[PDB]
């Protein structure tokens, strides 16, 4: 049962060369990675942005299921077909999510879209690995991940230009394109449409055909790649050396599931058990840390801005004003001290304003568009408000007598920060790609992990506004190398019989770790700036420790 097939396949690929076909397939699969990045951003940063100006993580729970299912099915029915199904499900349910009226059905549709998009990546990497020669499985496969960053910047810029506002968890209606939230989904999902359109021009991986048994089809695909590569140059038209290398569906479904479970079991045995356990450790730690910190950074930015505004607030003791009719808008925080006999306030727009220990007699409010303003220890007496935004929600406990309410009325920076963050990892790729074949996958992984560990402490030094963005950029640019190195290692180690299954399972573990990291890190945002600085450091320490215990690239 010696695997001479792998050696012969590599021989054919090396004879063929790296022609135009590799770059064409690179673009086609990069569009799918772009779709993955857009969905990740829209599920981690835009979806929770829907507030009342976090049940948005169930999409991750669907992502993990999709990753496992598509990874298992790909090695049975093919890589191209599973990628097509994944993108199709994601795109169709994104279109359906752009029309629904209500948050619950929206979450359901985005969950079912995350299923497919999470399936995407494992298939993409296992698919492109089989076409590259063993010489450059690091340089090109690393270049392939720039499309995740391009998709991130695409989503961030589109949100920053189309939906610079937020608060639509309770703002919707039967109309269309009337909130600008229903135009973000379509222009985020266009990349998936392009990916599906382009994936029909590429042939299936020859390795899957050779393993399944249809050697002629793999030979045909290799012939196609050779023909295109040689014709690209024009003059050299080198020839190819020809060589050999009803109760009817329930049983079939059970059979396919049993084969997938056999593939999963094979990942854990006298061989591949140690490798897979080490892989799980590294992937969990890395994804945990990265997602947690990428979510904590904009939140800390917001909290620092809030603290600055709180410290930028002043008040002076109020006096008794006869028909003050202060018809100008106020941005001061408090107005402690108030008598205000015969008040005649009209058409004043308070933001961040408070009245404490104030008194109002025969006061009259005409129209106030109050927001974030509340009344504490206010002794209203014979007060009529007519049209106001005052309710029990905006009104703290206080003494009110003979008060009447005749009538009543009914993002821009998180996206910029994330855009800079995702645009700052491009140098990390433009260094990882040109050094991973020269330096080494394992050692580059170790160095990148330890560098991320050291930058973890730096995360806290920059309590200023600018230093936080600087440190986010640094962290991303440092950890991208680890991600690329581990991708190359994972694709190289597992053979074609279990590559996609193993990668999909580790992707599911990474998504579960993303959920746990988001939850834990947002649980203690602004708690001495140490919990996200100690937990991340420990996790990356485990990652670096494990990274030095993996088998070489030959494994």
């Amino acid at each position, epitope marked *: 049962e010696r695997e001479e097939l792998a050696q012969q396949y590599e021989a054919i690929l090396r004879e063929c060369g790296h022609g135009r076909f590799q770059w064409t397939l690179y673009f086609v699969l990069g569009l799918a990675l772009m779709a993955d990045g857009v969905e990740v951003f829209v599920v981690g940063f835009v979806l929770p942005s829907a507030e009342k100006d976090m049940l948005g993580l169930i999409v991750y729970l669907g992502m993990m299921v999709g990753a496992f299912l598509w990874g298992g099915l790909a090695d049975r029915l093919g890589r191209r077909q599973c990628l097509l199904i994944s993108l199709s499900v994601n795109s169709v349910f994104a279109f359906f999510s752009s029309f629904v009226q209500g948050y619950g059905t929206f979450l359901f549709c985005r969950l079912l879209s995350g299923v497919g998009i999470g399936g995407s990546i494992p298939i993409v990497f296992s698919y492109f690995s089989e076409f590259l020669a063993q010489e450059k499985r690091g340089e090109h496969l690393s270049w392939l991940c720039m499309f995740w960053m391009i998709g991130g910047v695409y989503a961030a810029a589109m949100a920053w230009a189309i939906i610079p506002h937020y608060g639509w968890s309770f703002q919707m209606g039967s109309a269309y394109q009337f909130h600008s939230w229903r135009v973000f989904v379509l222009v985020c999902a266009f990349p998936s449409v392009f990916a599906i359109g382009a994936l029909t021009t590429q042939p299936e991986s020859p390795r899957f055909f050779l393993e399944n048994g249809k050697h002629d089809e793999a030979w045909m695909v290799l012939k196609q790649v050779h023909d295109t590569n040689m014709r690209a140059k024009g003059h050299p038209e080198r020839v190819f050396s020809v060589t050999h290398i009803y109760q009817r569906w329930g049983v079939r479904a059970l059979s396919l599931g049993g084969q997938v479970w056999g593939n999963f079991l094979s990942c854990f045995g006298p061989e591949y058990r140690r490798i897979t356990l080490m892989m799980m450790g590294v992937w969990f730690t890395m994804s945990f840390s990265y997602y947690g910190l990428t979510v904590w950074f904009p939140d800390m930015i917001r909290h620092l801005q809030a603290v600055d505004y709180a410290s930028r607030t002043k008040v002076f003791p109020g006096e008794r004003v006869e028909h003050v009719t202060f018809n100008f808008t106020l941005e001061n925080q408090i107005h402690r001290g108030g008598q205000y006999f*015969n008040d005649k306030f009209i058409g004043l727009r308070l933001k961040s304003v408070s009245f404490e220990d104030s008194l109002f007699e*025969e006061c*009259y409010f005409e129209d106030v568009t109050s927001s974030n303003t509340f009344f504490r220890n206010c002794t209203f007496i*014979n007060t*009529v408000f*007519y*049209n106001t935004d005052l309710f029990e929600y905006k009104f703290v406990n206080s003494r009110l007598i003979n008060s*009447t309410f*005749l*009538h009543n009325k009914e993002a821009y920076m998180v996206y910029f920060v994330s855009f800079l963050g995702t645009l700052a990892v491009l140098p990390g790729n433009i260094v990882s790609a040109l050094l991973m074949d020269k330096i080494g996958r394992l050692r580059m992984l170790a160095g990148s992990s330890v560098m991320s560990c050291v930058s973890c402490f730096f995360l806290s030094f920059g309590n200023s506004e600018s230093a936080m963005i600087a440190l986010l950029c640094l962290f991303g640019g440092v950890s991208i190398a680890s991600w690329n190195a581990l991708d190359v290692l994972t694709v190289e180690l597992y053979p074609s019989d279990k590559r996609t299954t193993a990668f999909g399972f580790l992707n599911a573990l990474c998504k579960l770790a993303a959920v746990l990291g988001i939850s834990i890190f947002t649980s203690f945002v602004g708690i001495t700036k140490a919990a996200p600085i100690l937990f991340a450091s420990a996790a990356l320490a485990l990652g670096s420790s494990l990274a030095l215990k993996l088998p070489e690239t030959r494994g």
Partner: nanobody
Amino acid sequence: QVQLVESGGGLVQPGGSLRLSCAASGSIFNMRVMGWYRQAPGEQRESVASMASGDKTTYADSVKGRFTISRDNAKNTVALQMNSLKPEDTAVYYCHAVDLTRNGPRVYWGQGTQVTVSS
């Protein structure tokens, strides 16, 4: 005490209209002239609309393209132009006045009039 006047109840078909006119007399000092409310069987009064002061108005979103308010201060009256009277949306309609005099704010309410829909 300002005496308020209520009117305009009875059956109107959807597609038809009614003019419910608020009026008042006595002790009126540049008042916010009576706006409208809908009283249901349940103890509660839903806002409808008001053109009570200046030339500006606030209409409830629930009465968009259904209840229109026009005011004539020179008369101390407010006219509610009822239209789009979908059959289920019946109510007792009330005039709500606000006194803007020297002794401070005071309010007045009428007994209301019942509007039902013909079909």
